[model samples]
Target: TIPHLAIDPFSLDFFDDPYPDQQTLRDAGPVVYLDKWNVYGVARYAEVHAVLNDPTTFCSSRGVGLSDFKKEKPWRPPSLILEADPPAHTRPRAVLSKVLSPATMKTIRDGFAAAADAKVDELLQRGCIDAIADLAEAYPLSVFPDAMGLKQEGREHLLPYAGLVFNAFGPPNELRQTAIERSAPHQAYVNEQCQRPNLAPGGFGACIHAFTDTGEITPDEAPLLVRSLLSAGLDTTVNGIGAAVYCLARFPGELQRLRSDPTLARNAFEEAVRFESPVQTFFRTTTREVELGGAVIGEGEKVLMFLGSANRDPRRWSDPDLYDITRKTSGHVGFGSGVHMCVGQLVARLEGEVMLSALARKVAAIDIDGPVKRRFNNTLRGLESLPVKLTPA
Candidate 1:
């Protein structure tokens, strides 16, 4: 039997700095029963990976959000990919997989890198920058909109809409309520932008519509699939860029190593991702009785996988808490694991590498002026304001 821990997942302390609590939970056991949510939590690297990969046993069909899709009211239509299972999820995944393939991503690399480099140059010229807003938010917001073929007006709604959608995945608390109020007006515009005619040709939105033309997926399903991209894509990348900057800044020597060899961009990005995961935790519902780490998980139980904790598990990593760019971090669960793993991860990685490489090339060193502030959200571990002094090279 699991011991009870009165841990409220939504508490401010948990959101502010979850690593300590995560470590405590992991020490207790691989799977701890959270009394607050009455759910099983997989905090260790081993069990968390097992659960994430075994969709056949621990299904995501009930929605990856907190509420059970089979019973509770859905905050919105389920994501075509994130909330889907095999066979049913197969076609859309296949279509999007090809569209977002590394080759397709490669076509846009130079453009994205150029844009990021230019932006970094501009910020460096300013002498100092917030890093989060100026670099992190600026880069993805600049590129992804045009890539999706969205008009200027429609593009304005992407960040707010994505914020609302991700918040809604958590409990129906004040944050969710605030999101609902803020999103009320833009709902129509977001809905409209998902349509074929409104999307720019050669964009992902347009590609989804092309699938509709071939009857691979219906016109109706196309918008929701595009909506999945909109919902899952933006904020994650924004925070991810911020996290990369924060990691390199906090960990000395790593940034210098990156500056020495720009090719280390890939390793740098992965190390930052492992150090501080942007997307913290996501839920899964147990399909039936499941045995994990010698614990019995009852049927229809909610399971929270702490990707952030698993990435730093000492069992799987040596000096896991240290932010080492040279560490072999290929198997880190920062982007998640299994079938429901992030499909747009390459897109996120490219954004990080391009922007980070630019900063490294221009800035000699980044020093924190004050304590960094974290934005409180149930699912995202995000930096809101990181005041820094950038010494331009």
Candidate 2:
């Protein structure tokens, strides 16, 4: 019998602020079974890390969402890379890795910086703006669509379609229902755009189609890969940008430190990812009965790995909850770890650094008035609005 742990995974209070619960759950010991969901949870940094790295023992193939893949209807196909285990997952990851390699990333660096600077200039001119929609969403959406060679209509559908798909990963609730209602109309358009002929030459979509041409992945799987990029990419960076700004604003001296040297932009973005952890939690399944933190995890059971909780876990780092750009945070699971880690992290980081550095350059200081609103989704922690007063340099 699984040890009874009285934790409500679906409660709004748990969703609103999970840190306290995370500590409680971790202290109760790893492999605590949630009666409500009937799933085991790994909350401590050490246990979560062990689960993520040991994919052979803890598999992702059963599904990364709550429902087992074999039992339920997936909102869409599971990610070719995120859902597959080693050997099977290797080839496709290689294809994508080659396309997004550091050398290729360097080629696009200046262009992204230019775009970010332009957006910052526009925002500074306006004096006051909703940081999320105006700056964060604007920067990535503006460049990434074109980089993928998608048309304007197809580009506009990326965020909403992705929003629906990610929210669908959770229990069918009002949030999922709301997303479905908002996205039903755009599904056809997004699907049509993913076809090989629909993609333009010399973009990421064309590169994905090239994999299909070589039989690296089935043509059926090709669009799903493109969809994964669209689904995981937009909202993460949009909210990430908001979180970065919030972090800097809350810690005044850090902004001055960044302004003194623009090179800190990369570290700032990395620290921001560690500090806020835009993508919070993902699920993994145990392949066989295993012992973790002195508890038994039965085979085929699911475990929730809270990346945000791990990043802030006191056991992992001194002053783990504080935002310090100078700290050595290389091991933080903010982008996740192991085989299923985010493939587009480099692209996301580039967009973040460029835009954030641009903001640092133009604004002497930024202050928020009133309470900031959070837009909650099952997988992403996003800001709905952040009212700010910017002091232009």
Candidate 3:
């Protein structure tokens, strides 16, 4: 029989600390009912990975959150790509794939790598700085918005808007409520910035708009793709790179392994993604009655998959909680699997490769010096302020 837990997944308590609930939910069973949110949960690695792949059976179109789009109105126009099924998803995804092609990313890769080197040199000289603000937040906000052709002014709206987007994926608790309240202006700015004149000439934003001329994606769809750049393209990297800094600082041994073989910087980033799992949760809705882990879930059920829990599930990984640099860190659901897997992951990987590799080139070690604060967004997992001392080589 499936166990039902009266746990509110959206609570600030859970957000403050989720590992215990992750263990409780996964340990309860492979599949359990979350009575508080009125949804089924898949907390184990195997089931979570399966649901991510079988999008046709476990759909994203209905809503990838507690709210069911069929029953309740969407909080916003659902992401034309993130929330749509195939056929609708195909063309936009193809257009986006080309928009973020390796060729296109390479143009900015070298520049970003140089930027990382310069940024690291500047911060390492300071000796002590908040890794979150000085490095993690500063790095992505610098390169990504400019890459998207956003104007210099009002670019400050990027992070809070992303925070609001991630929060809206959960139950409308105080966390989501506060994010909406704080980001109202940011939301309008993000939307307006996607327009043609608002964007810089010859950037990802312009390229997305160009697809309309080829009849690849609609005029309406162009801005949404630009919206994806602001929303998905930024925070994941910020928190992802943040997680790497946090992990390496805590495990100096791994940091040394990375420094010695600067080549391992990419591996370090992947391992950090797997170990900490920055994008902690995402939802998938069932299209029909489906049997999973001995529990038969009904049609149209919202299955909240705990990516943070699954990444550390002992059954699939050995010493799952340890942040080891040598682990074969492949096949992580930190970036979901299958067709809907993150399109922005390559960009994140490029940014991580350059950023960490650049740090390894100059920095001796990343050691925590002062207080570390956590930013508990509903879906994103990361630090708000990670005060640390960067020892330069």
Q: How many residue pairs clash in model 3?
A: 0
Model 3 lDDT tens row, 1-393:
999998777777887888888899989999999988888998999999999989888998998877899999886788988999897999999888998898888789888898898899999789999999999999988788888898888877888888889998988788777876756588789999988778777788999998889888989888888988888999999999999999999999888888889998888899899988888989998999999999998998899999988999988999998998779988878988898888877889989988889877898988898988998888988999999999989
Question: Candidate 1: misplaced stretches above 4 Å?
Answer: none
Model 2: which residue pairs collide?
none
* Number of the top TM-score candidate: 3
Please list the C-alpha lDDT of all candidates, in the order they appear: 0.83, 0.79, 0.88
Error of 2 at 174 (Å): 2.5
- What is the C-alpha local distance difference test score of candidate 3? 0.88
Candidate 1 per-residue lDDT over residues 104-205, each given as its tens digit: 797788988999998988877876678777878888998987777888875677778877877777777777778877576566778888988899888888
TM-score of model number 2: 0.95
The TM-score, computed over Cα atoms with residue i paired to residue i, of candidate 1 is 0.97
Q: Write down the worst ten-residue block by lDDT for model 2.
A: 1-10
For each candidate in turn, the TM-score is: 0.97, 0.95, 0.97
Question: What are the clashing pairs of model 3?
Answer: none
